[PDB]
Design a protein around this ligand. Structure first.
Ligand code: NI
Ligand code: NI
Length: 221
C-alpha cells in the first residue's frame, strides 16, 4: 500500500492473507465462512490463507486455513487482464469472530467521486514490506477517464480508483485485496501501471458489481 497508515487492528476482519512457503503473494476477501474472493491472477494449486491477522505469522484468535479448491472466472484474461476474480473454497468453514468477519458485495456499480478504502500487506512507498496491515483511501474515477487512459485494455469488468496527487494506490502484494465503498466490497485490487503511486494514473480494480450472479451460483455449487 502506497502512502497509507497502519490499520487499526482488526478493522478489516474480511482481509484474507494468501501465503505460500511462509511468503505472502496476494490477498483475498472473506465473502462467506467457507469462501474467499480474490484476484484470478492470484491462483494457486493449494492455498494457505491467514485470517484475523494484523501482523503476519503473534495474534490470538487468528486462523491459518488450508484450501485446495478454487474457481477462476471462465473469462479471466479474455480479453487481456479482464475478469480478474476467483473463488476459493476453504477446507473447513471458519467460525466468525470479532477479528474474522465476512463482507457483502456491492450491488450498485461504482460511483465517481466516492472515497473508498483499500487494504493490504503490499509494498510501501519505500519499497519494503510492512509488518502491520496497511489501510488507505482512494477515490473512484469516472469511466470516461478510466476508459481512455487504459485503452485498449479497458473492460467493463474494470473500474479505476485513485490516481490522485496524494499518490495513494495499491501495489505488489495488495493484489486481490478489497476496495471497500460505503461498507460494501466494491472491488478487488487487479492491476495498474508500474510503478505504484503515479500521479494521474489510477489503479484498476475488479468490478464486482458485474459478477454478483456468477459468484452466487459458484458458491451454491
Ligand atoms: Ni490484535
Ligand atoms: Ni497482481
Amino acid at each position: 500500500i502506497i502512502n497509507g497508515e497502519d490499520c487499526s487492528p482488526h478493522s478489516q476482519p474480511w482481509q484474507a492473507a494468501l501465503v505460500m512457503e511462509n511468503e505472502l503473494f496476494c490477498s483475498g476477501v472473506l465473502v462467506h465462512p467457507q469462501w474467499v474472493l480474490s484476484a484470478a491472477h492470484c491462483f494457486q494449486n493449494s492455498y494457505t490463507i491467514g485470517l484475523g491477522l494484523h501482523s503476519l505469522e503473534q495474534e490470538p484468535g487468528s486462523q491459518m486455513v488450508e484450501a485446495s479448491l478454487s474457481v477462476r472466472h471462465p473469462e479471466y484474461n479474455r480479453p487481456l487482464l479482464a475478469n480478474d476474480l476467483m473463488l476459493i473454497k476453504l477446507d473447513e468453514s471458519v467460525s466468525e469472530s470479532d477479528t474474522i468477519r465476512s463482507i457483502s458485495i456491492a450491488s450498485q456499480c461504482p460511483t465517481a467521486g466516492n472515497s473508498c478504502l483499500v487494504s493490504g500487506w503490499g509494498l510501501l512507498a519505500n519499497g519494503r514490506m510492512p509488518t502491520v496491515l496497511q489501510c488507505v483511501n482512494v477515490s473512484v474515477v469516472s469511466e470516461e477517464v478510466c476508459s481512455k487512459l487504459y485503452d485498449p485494455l479497458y473492460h467493463p469488468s474494470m473500474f479505476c480508483a485513485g490516481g490522485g496527487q496524494d499518490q495513494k494506490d495499491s501495489c505488489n502484494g495488495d493484489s486481490g485485496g478489497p476496495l471497500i465503498c460505503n461498507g460494501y466490497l466494491q472491488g478487488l485490487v487487479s492491476f495498474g501501471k508500474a510503478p505504484c503511486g503515479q500521479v494521474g494514473v489510477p489503479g484498476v480494480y475488479t468490478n464486482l458489481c458485474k459478477f454478483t450472479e456468477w459468484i452466487e451460483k459458484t458458491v451454491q455449487a
